[PDB]
Every structure is written in C-alpha cells, then in structure tokens.
Amino acid sequence: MLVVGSELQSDAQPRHGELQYLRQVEHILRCGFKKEDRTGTGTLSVFGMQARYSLRDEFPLLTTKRVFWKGVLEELLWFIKGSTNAKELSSKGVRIWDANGSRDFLDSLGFSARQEGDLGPVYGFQWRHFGAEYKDMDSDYSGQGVDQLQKVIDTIKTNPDDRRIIMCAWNPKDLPLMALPPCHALCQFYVVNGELSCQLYQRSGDMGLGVPFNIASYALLTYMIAHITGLQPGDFVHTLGDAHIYLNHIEPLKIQLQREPRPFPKLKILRKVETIDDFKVEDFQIEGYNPHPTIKMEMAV
Amino acid sequence: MLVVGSELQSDAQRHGELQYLRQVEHILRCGFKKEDRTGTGTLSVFGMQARYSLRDEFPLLTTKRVFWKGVLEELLWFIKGSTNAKELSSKGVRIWDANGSRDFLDSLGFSARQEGDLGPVYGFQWRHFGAEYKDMDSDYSGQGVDQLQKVIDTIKTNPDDRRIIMCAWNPKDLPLMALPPCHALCQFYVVNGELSCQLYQRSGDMGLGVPFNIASYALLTYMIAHITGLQPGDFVHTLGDAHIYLNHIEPLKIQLQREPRPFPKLKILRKVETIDDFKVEDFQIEGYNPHPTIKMEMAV
Ligand SMILES: Cc1nc(=O)c2cc(CN(C)c3ccc(C(=O)N[C@@H](CCC(=O)O)C(=O)O)s3)ccc2[nH]1
Ligand SMILES: Cc1nc(=O)c2cc(CN(C)c3ccc(C(=O)N[C@@H](CCC(=O)O)C(=O)O)s3)ccc2[nH]1
Ligand SMILES: O=c1ccn([C@H]2C[C@H](O)[C@@H](COP(=O)(O)O)O2)c(=O)[nH]1
Ligand SMILES: O=c1ccn([C@H]2C[C@H](O)[C@@H](COP(=O)(O)O)O2)c(=O)[nH]1
C-alpha cells in the first residue's frame, strides 16, 4: 500500500515548510482522482490546494530531493530581463524551456514561421511590457506596455498597505501566441509588520517536476523584492488550481515520501542592490543546502 | 474575550458554512492590525482557502441573511457585459452606486465621466478583454476576447483543459477602473462529470462582500454546469488580503454565536441553452431559513 515517512502525519490542509509539500503529494496519491490530460500521460489530480512556506531566516529549497537551484536563479534573472527566447536561457546551461521552444513543438502549435526558441509573449514580456504588441523575441519593447514588476516595487515602497500589488502573466489577448500559457497566472504581494509576503496562483502544478522549482522561484523573487524595498521576507503562499501527479511520477514520489527531510538552507544576498535589473547570479549564495539525491522526474511533453 | 458557537471547533485551515465562520474567527484571533485605503483600518491575514460543496446544496449563508436578489441581478448584469451601475441600480440593487457616484469618480480624477460609469471592470473584461474602453454605453460588439463564452466552449470540447480561466485583472486598463477587481480571476475544472470553480480574490471584506461573493461564484458555477450538461462540484474560495474592518468586529461577533442551519437549494426552472439567455425568473432558492441580516457598513 502507500507507505510514507512518519513525520507527515495528517496530510489534510508557519513551521516545517517541506512537510507542507510532501503532505500535498501524499494527499493527491491517497485522495486524488484519475484525470486525463493534454500530454496524453494521465494524472492523479486534486483541484484547489494551498500551502504556506515561511521565508524567515530560511529558504524553501526542498531537501528530500535536490532541486535545480542554478536553473531557478537563471530562469528568474531571465524573466526579469524581459526575455522570451528560450535559447538565451539554454546558453546558461538551463534547458528547462527548450522543449517548448523547439522547432517541432512550435510547429505542432502552428507556429511555422517564428524562430526556434521564441516562446511568444510569456512571463518576461507580460511582467515588463503588459499590453504591448508582441512581434518576436528579438524586438525592442523599451517603454512599451505596463512594467508590472517595477510598479509592484514602487507600490511596496510608497503604499505598503495597498491590496492591489499584483503581477499578472495571464493575458487573454496574447494567449494564442504563447507556446505554453502561463502556469503561474498571477502573484500578489502584501506587507504587514515590516515583512513582505507573496501569494502565487498556479493554475496547473506538476507536483513532481515543476512545483518544487516553482516554490523556490517565487521564494527567490520575494527575497529579491524584499531586499530592494528594505523589508524582511515573510511567507510564500502557494495556491494551486489543478494539482497533479503524472502517472510516471508515482513511483519516484513514493521514494521521496519515505526520505527524512533536512532543515532548509538559507539564502544570502552578497551586496546591497538598489534596483531589480541590477541583480546578478554572483549576488546570491545558498548556504547549508544538504539534500538527498536527485530523483529523475521526466517532463511530459 | 471572543465567544463563539460550539460547532466551529478548530478554526485552522457539519457544514460548508463553518468554513466561513472559522475564517472570521481566525482573523479575529490571529489577524494583524493593518491600515487601509478607506481610512477605516482592519484586522488582516494574507492567504486563506475554503471549499464549499455545491452538490445538492447552495452556499448562501444562514447565520446572516445574504442579499440574494443582488447576487443574481449583479451576475446577470456582468453577463450582459455592463459596466453601468445605473442599469443595476434600476433593478433595486445599489451595491455599485457608491463606486459610480459623482463624488467618488471625481476623487479619482474622472470628472468628465458620466455617473454610474465604473470603467472597464468585470462586464467589460469578461466579454471584451483587450478592447479599447471609451465609456459605459459604447458599442463593443465583436471587440476583444469573450472569455465567458470561451470558458463555456472549452468545458464542452475539452473538459480536462487546465487553462479554463476568466481574468478580470487587466493591468493596461486598471487606471480607468473605479475599483480594480476584487476578483482577479477564476478557474474552472472538470472531473467525474462535476464542474468546479476556484476564485482568486485579492481583497476580501469578510463582513460585507465575501458572503455575497461566495454566492456569486456558486451561482456562476451552477449556470455554467447547467449549459454544459455537468453537475456542480466544488467552489474553492482563495483570498489574498482577508480582512475585517474595525466597525464590523462587533457585528461579526454576534454572527459567530448564531447556530447555522442547513444551506438552501438552488433550482434552475427551465432548460437554458446559452449563458446570455438566463433570466431572474429561471432560478429559485428553496429552503432558505437564515437568521436576520446584520448591517455591515460599506467603507468608502
Ligand atoms: C508537464 C510539464 N511539467 C513541468 O513541470 C514543466 C515545467 C516547465 C518549466 N520549468 C519550470 C521546469 C522544467 C524542468 C525543471 C526542472 O527542475 N528540471 C530538473 C529536474 C529534471 C527531472 O527530474 O527530470 C533538471 O533539469 O535538472 S523546472 C516547462 C514545461 C513543463 N511541463
Ligand atoms: C469596502 C468595500 N467592501 C465591500 O465588500 C464592497 C463590495 C462591493 C460590491 N459588492 C459585491 C457588494 C456591495 C454591497 C453588498 C451587500 O451584500 N449589501 C447588503 C448588505 C449591506 C450592509 O450590510 O451594509 C445590502 O445592500 O442589503 S455586496 C463594492 C465595494 C465594496 N467596498
Ligand atoms: O512552471 C511551470 C510550468 C508548467 N507546469 C506544469 C503543469 C502541467 O503539468 C504542465 C503544463 O500543461 P498545461 O497545464 O498547460 O496542460 O506543466 C508547472 O508545473 N510549472
Ligand atoms: O466584490 C467585492 C468588491 C470589493 N471587496 C472589498 C475588499 C476591500 O475591502 C474593498 C476594496 O478595496 P481595495 O482592496 O481595492 O482597497 O472592497 C470585496 O470584498 N468584494
């Protein structure tokens, strides 16, 4: 039968961050329903989940399997620069978007004429140029559309009480040009007691592959914005729509659920950075990260 | 102290209604003081979720009567694409009149705008996302993305799709809105022939708007389930800044001591084929035996 580490206890929906994730996995295995999907693989699925990860002197990079930190960091810097060229990320040894920008994938979507790598008007473009007319991944979009990311930063500084501190990549007008509509549809920031928190609405979560990387990604973004606004990191709240385990991840996750978590690492920012675009890979240091080995989770395409 | 009905038990995230009451309890117990736009002040928590079954019941709160006439009229008004508060007010539903008032509009710099013109809010975004807003009574036929109809068509053709979203949050249009949407987006989901809906609500006035909003999205899900031949499943309510305005604390403490009753049922009285064809007379709420309304003032 399904056997799990004794520390999970009740999986039913802060402290002990990693257990929040492992309990969601357990809950989907135990209570999820079979749901067919776009890729033809099949999933077990639950609709509507929420987990809270404290960011207060800890950073939620999972320890029950090693997570691809280099990729998390490169990807987020790539978003920040407004990039939608998967080849530019791949040149940093981070190949996570290559499959979606491939000649054969793009062709399957009917995007014959665009260049390989061109993901269309996805996060980088929507976060920094929302509403601008997308042309291609090489076009200069300087001063075009809404720079949501800077606006969030400016609002946190001037009116931290504001309940409208949102960055949204879901753009119905642009959806048909995207190689993958965004899994992270929107995030909201919140300030109380000198702490910055972030909530992600993730419409679709591949619990074995993307979700651990995604948690680390928004935790990092929150650390970055906290740094620039002179706040301390608070909580990362992870909300999921279709939370799913692909059938070929069931056995790998069952290995993972039996591993003892270790304490989370810390993230250090190594200098005073004044603006979000000035961050560089050399500015960050993960300390004390002691994960169990990688478990291969294949990507369904 | 805070005293509450015995059936709430643990407020940590039987009845669907108890999940609302437990949220309210939780904010009073654990919430932090936070100042706000209206000047009123709140007790606040960031990030909550609750799940309301829609299976042979309808989540209209029984611990305090909820303005059902207004829920229904408002949703019909959204579906028509309207952003004109006067057209809702004419139905006896005044819930948007303050936001559309001469004085409030002027407070935002919209002195040249007609009273009642809420800007490019829900009706416009749901039916015309991406179109260029002019004014509330302009002709937007065929302009922008009809997200509502796209949702319905996707549920019919590809119920497993993980992209079935309607989003009112439009960064380009926000400066023209009299109030940026409290309901930023919603997502639909299908499994085992049941339709569920999740709402992302960025800001929830727990005393006033949130009970009304719960009923709004439940009703939407009932409508869409009907048109698509599915059964209603769950309504999942997700909150950003979940707050209690200071002048609602004592009214909500009254509420929390009332005994919940079973939820009512919602009946759809005829076969309706298109979303646009629903009318007030197509619905009946049966078995609604609430405790009396508690006045919760609207801030700003
Ligand atoms: C079905 C699917 N699931 C996903 O999670 C997904 C994620 C992305 C983008 N993304 C956010 C990521 C893609 C791959 C990642 C990753 O962490 N890879 C690790 C582990 C690989 C493995 O275990 O197979 C690595 O490459 O080392 S993180 C794109 C398409 C997707 N499609
Ligand atoms: C601060 C604020 N809180 C709100 O909840 C809010 C809600 C709307 C829109 N909306 C969705 C609603 C407004 C009023 C409602 C309502 O249920 N009214 C009842 C109860 C009134 C009362 O208790 O004072 C009614 O009119 O009978 S529902 C607009 C601005 C807002 N502003
Ligand atoms: O950062 C991301 C990008 C995507 N996905 C997953 C969710 C789905 O398994 C798949 C996207 O497929 P659709 O939901 O669009 O079908 O990738 C993630 O988990 N995180
Ligand atoms: O349907 C709605 C509309 C608004 N609000 C509340 C939340 C806030 O109390 C207020 C909006 O104020 P801001 O969050 O925009 O400041 O109205 C709701 O609860 N539901």
Residue numbers in the entry:
A (entry chain B): 1 to 13, 20 to 307
B (entry chain A): 1 to 13, 21 to 307
From the primary publication:
Thymidylate synthase (TS; EC 2.1.1.45), a target enzyme in antitumor chemotherapy, catalyzes the N(5,10)-methylenetetrahydrofolate- (mTHF-) dependent C(5)-methylation of deoxyuridylate (dUMP), leading to the formation of thymidylate (dTMP), a nucleotide required for DNA biosynthesis. The enzyme, being a homodimer, is strongly conserved among the prokaryotic and eukaryotic species, from bacteria to mammals. A feature distinguishing mammalian from bacterial TS enzymes is N-terminal extension by some 27 amino acid residues, present in the former but absent in the latter enzymes. However, that protein segment is usually disordered and thus absent in the crystal structures of a mammalian TS.
The present paper reports the first structure of mammalian TS—the tertiary complex of mouse TS (mTS) with dUMP and the strong antifolate inhibitor and anticancer drug, Raltitrexed—with a clearly defined segment of 13 N-terminal amino acids. The crystal structure of mouse thymidylate synthase (mTS) in complex with dUMP and Raltitrexed comprises two homodimers, AB and CD, consisting of chains A, B, C, and D, represented by continuous and (overall) well-defined electron densities for amino acids 21–307, 20–307, 21–302, and 21–304, respectively. The ligands, dUMP and Raltitrexed, are described by clear electron densities in all subunits. Unexpectedly, an N-terminal segment consisting of residues 1–13, usually disordered in mammalian thymidylate synthases, is clearly visible in all subunits, even though the following segment 14–20 (14–19 in chain B) is not visible on the electron density maps and has not been included in the final model. The segment was stable enough to show up unambiguously on the electron density maps, probably owing to crystal packing, rather than intramolecular interactions. The subunit active sites are similar within each dimer but significantly different between the two dimers AB and CD, with the latter being related to the degree of the closure of a given active site. Moreover, considering noticeable electron densities between mTS Cys189 γS and dUMP C6 in the subunits A and B, including continuous electron density at 1.8σ in the latter subunit, the presence of the γS-C6 covalent bond in some fraction of the population of mTS-dUMP-Raltitrexed molecules may be expected. In addition, in accord with more closed conformation of the dimer AB than CD, the C-terminal segment that contributes to the active site closing and enzyme catalysis is described by a well-defined electron density throughout the segment in the former, in contrast to a weaker electron density, resulting in the lack of a few most terminal residues in the latter. Altogether, these results show Raltitrexed binding to influence the present structure in an asymmetric manner, changing the conformation of one protein dimer (AB) more than the other (CD).
